[PDB]
């Protein structure tokens with residue numbers, strides 16, 4: 001239970017989150033070991049008028065943790081305990097636990113799985129608060145759809161800090177706090193010290209009331225050389241990917257056992273890469289997977305080089321996942337998001353193609369398209385703070401790089417692509433049409449700027465749609481002093 | 492603590508270690524949560540005559556855990572606690588902890604670092620028992636050079652299991668058990684439940700008696716396209732790499748702050764890849780690093796594409812490291828090892844080149860050359876069970892692939908290259924010449940076969956040299972019933 005000031009040599013490491021474009025430089029970091037430590041620390045800070053913020057996994061796409069300047073940053077990585085829920089079924093998970101830790105614990109102790117993300121180093125803190133989706137989401141829904149309770153340290157009008165727990169079944173103000181944590185996003189209401197999970201009745205199994213991890217996964221990665229792909233066949237492949245998702249994204253369908261990630265890389269990478277996994281319990285021969293993959297490229301001259309097989313759950317999952325190692329470490333990055341309810345037009349796809357061929361250093365520049373929908377779309381838009389309940393594909397527009405001197409170049413490329421792709425609707429994926437806005441866990445500060453966003457739609461509507469009002473009430477009720485704020489925090 | 496039998500769905504996952512060539516299929520797995528669970532479980536098992544083995548990180552290069560058939564496998568991954576020793580110098584680390592957990596804990600709690608390996612998923616269990624080296628080893632030595640104590644469950648002549656702790660300062664039988672754990676290799680003496688680490692005086696710092704982690708690391712990766720490299724320039728680059736290590740591998744030298752990993756990939760990968768890191772506290776501008784890299788390719792037409800920079804310790808280390816993700820998962824693999832005391836001949840290097848160009852599916856086939864020596868070579872060969880104390884480069888000869896039907900093909904290529912490269916000395920890197928044998932943590936069953944090994948030097952001499960006799964005595968004393976054995980275990 002210690003403190004790391006500017007004078008301490010651990011400070012330099014602590015001053016970097018995953019995205020190296022932003023720096024976190026408080027007077028001190030505090031590393032708590034228990035929720036009580038969190039409470040005492042916050043109390044000391046707010047009484048003394050010091051500004052605070054917390055960090056779990058450090059994966060934030062923006063400067064939320066370290067901007068504006070903080071006096072105190074709580075680093076939560078020691079709060080990583082996983083155990084049965086005190087009361088009832090379910091599992092309690094510390095907010096400082098990473099996806100990797102959670103997956104391993106759930107699987108090894110209970111043969112259980114939650115729809116956690118594909119990146120093993122992401123922290124539960126931000127992931128859960130923002131919604132959270134993953135390769136299992138078409139079967140299991142969003143992470144917040146399994147949320148039973150939240151234990152969070154909040155600050156009231158009299159500057160008193162309290163540890164409150166808010167449950168799925170609570171009403172009144174507690175009910176609002178709980179609901180606000182099912183997609184409201186981190187850094188808004190207080191410091192979550194733990195989450196409790198309990199699945200919906202139709203997904204729950206024993207022993208702990210979570211879903212069963214599949215016995216086996218069909219996993220497959222297919223590399224397509226850019227050299228074999230012209231504009232026309234590119235447009236065809238993309239269109240088919242999207243149309244397959246248009247047809248096969250109902251809750252409960254057989255195809256909901258399948259999840260694809262399409263890395264549409266800038267041409268300097270030499271390849272497009274398709275990753276697909278399917279639950280082998282549902283489909284022992286992986287017929288659906290084979291048909292999907294084959295159908296993508298049938299009519300074209302495009303031939304992919306496949307690799308993979310059938311693997312046990314933990315091994316297959318790690319084979320498909322991104323860990324905290326190699327070239328994703330220490331990098332500067334920028335990302336944008338879009339929810340798709342239907343396929344992009346062919347003209348949009350042509351714009352994409354063109355930008356993927358521009359003269360640009362894009363060995364780590366790409367657009368990722370993920371399968372979405374399925375079980376996710378079972379719920380109604382108002383049931384959780386996350387509003388998007390009828391999209392079928394989710395996209396992430398991404399660029400990473402090393403030197404600060406190249407920031408403008410890379411932002412330039414990303415903006416150029418995104419804004420042109422969505423030029424028909426003011427350069428953003430407006431809600432209620434072919435698209436349904438953006439995902440708060442891929443926050444994008446450009447949405448605040450009229451030069452970037454000409455749609456008339458404010459950031460809070462793209463992220464929260466009609467849930468914003470309720471989030472605002474919850475904010476007034478639970479953080480009246482605006483103790484927790486950042487450049488895109490609830491108003 | 493709990494048990495996983497054949498009807499339990501978790502069994503499927505537990506039946507695979509990292510190397511998918513081998514399967515581990517006992518009647519049950521047991522998952523202890525404490526050292527006493529380990530003791531009680533072993534006791535039951537040996538009393539009822541059941542065969543046992545343990546597993547920590549599952550990184551074993553061979554079938555040691557699951558062959559011969561076991562009735563019971565103890566999976567140790569829950570024994571991962573890290574805390575101050577009690578006491579009150581040094582740190583206690585559960586045998587089930589991974590490199591990643593240890594690095595993070597040491598760094599975040601004490602600004603400390605041990606010379607752990609470059610692979611984050613490797614378990615302390617096997618790593619430590621075998622010796623253990625890493626990017627920090629030229630400054631800090633081997634992991635076993637920081638070993639202060641070992642807490643291990645052993646089985647005596649009357650089939651009684653007991654938890655004993657053996658200390659660096661112990662004499663008699665206990666002293667032997669401790670010494671045997673400093674390089675004797677896993678699966679030999681009993682189930683280690685924990686290690687305690689306390690560094691040599693000259694490396695130790697407050698508050699826990701471990702070394703200080705560097706403030707910053709220069710880290711650099713350089714890619715050389717095969718297309719720009721002909722046989723001659725390949726031989727030149729390799730020769731320079733080795734010669735640089737011949738000159739700059741004394742303990743305490745400035746250059747000992749530098750560590751390089753050269754992935755010499757089969758041509759189908761399109762590139763050779765050089766990774767280099769240097770302690771930035773010792774050399775703030777990274778001059779040594781820059782000169783080393785430049786000197787490798789000066790005279791040639793070869794031009795590398797570099798990337799990297801100066802990073803904080805945890806970030807830099809993870810940037811250079813291999814984690815449990817992507818294409819290293821679920822694969823079948825084979826590896827061989829060699830210690831080099833001096834540069835290979837140019838004719839050996841030509842052999843290497845030619846095999847790297849053979850028509851073979853080698854997108855994950857390569858030879859990795861790692862800087863060695865420095866602090867490692869401070870100790871004498873008999874001080875720990877690890878005998879190699881004057882080598883300057885360490886090589887790993889590696890192939891990984893997916894389909895069982897291709898085993899023979901890949902083994903074929905690996906054997907073909909290794910045995911030809913060392914043809915001068917019976918197809919193995921014999922001790923006491925240009926080479927100094929093999930590293931038990933890269934175990935290689937081919938050393939047991941006369942068709943593969945024509946040197947006359949038995950596996951136990953290549954791995955342990957003149958420490959074998961002492962290891963055997965320790966084995967007789969501490970595992971008289973040969974409860975713990977495998978295809979390359981210390982003979983009783």
Ligand SMILES: *Cc1cc2c(nc3c(=O)[nH]c(=O)nc-3n2C[C@H](O)[C@H](O)[C@H](O)COP(=O)(O)OP(=O)(O)OC[C@H]2O[C@@H](n3cnc4c(N)ncnc43)[C@H](O)[C@@H]2O)c(*)c1C
Nearest residue numbers: 056057058059060117118119123125126127133186187192
């Ligand atoms: C970098 C990265 C992000 C990913 C990746 N994969 C994802 C996936 O497969 N599915 C997803 O749905 N999301 C994926 N993401 C995005 C992550 O979800 C977001 O980046 C998360 O917001 C990150 O969470 P965390 O790692 O904890 O990030 P932080 O930087 O620490 O925090 C963000 C934000 O939230 C506040 N906050 C953190 N913790 C708390 C708690 N305890 N209570 C309140 N508020 C908290 C922080 O202060 C900050 O404001 C794959 C990759 C590589």
Ligand SMILES: *Cc1cc2c(nc3c(=O)[nH]c(=O)nc-3n2C[C@H](O)[C@H](O)[C@H](O)COP(=O)(O)OP(=O)(O)OC[C@H]2O[C@@H](n3cnc4c(N)ncnc43)[C@H](O)[C@@H]2O)c(*)c1C
Nearest residue numbers: 547548549550551555608609610614616617624677678683
């Ligand atoms: C796969 C892999 C291995 C690496 C990597 N990097 C290394 C590095 O950078 N430096 C090294 O020095 N070594 C590296 N290695 C090799 C590993 O060190 C060895 O492969 C280890 O022996 C593996 O350790 P572990 O993960 O624990 O392997 P297991 O298979 O579980 O066990 C091996 C062996 O030892 C016995 N054993 C395990 N645990 C115990 C305990 N507690 N007590 C006694 N015996 C134990 C097992 O029975 C088995 O016999 C990078 C990569 C990717």
Ligand SMILES: C=Cc1cc(OC)c2c(c1)[C@H](O)Oc1c-2cc(OC)c2c(O)ccc([C@H]3O[C@@H]([C@@H](C)O)[C@H](O)[C@H]3O)c12
Nearest residue numbers: 059060061118133134135261322328334335370396398442
């Ligand atoms: C559920 C399927 C899924 C599969 C993935 O992989 C198969 C990834 C993701 C989802 C995911 O949503 O995000 C990432 C994935 C993979 C990465 O690497 C290979 C990612 C990376 O290298 C960087 C960032 C992200 C993410 O962080 C956000 C940052 C900016 O906050 C970005 O908006 C994201 O791009 C990655």
Ligand SMILES: C=Cc1cc(OC)c2c(c1)[C@H](O)Oc1c-2cc(OC)c2c(O)ccc([C@H]3O[C@@H]([C@@H](C)O)[C@H](O)[C@H]3O)c12
Nearest residue numbers: 550551552608609624625626752813819826861887889933
């Ligand atoms: C200290 C520097 C260092 C850096 C490394 O990396 C930068 C690795 C190693 C050392 C190390 O000695 O071993 C490995 C390294 C990297 C890998 O990946 C990138 C390895 C891999 O992918 C597989 C196996 C090994 C190892 O396991 C053994 C298996 C067979 O038991 C093999 O004999 C080894 O090859 C790796």
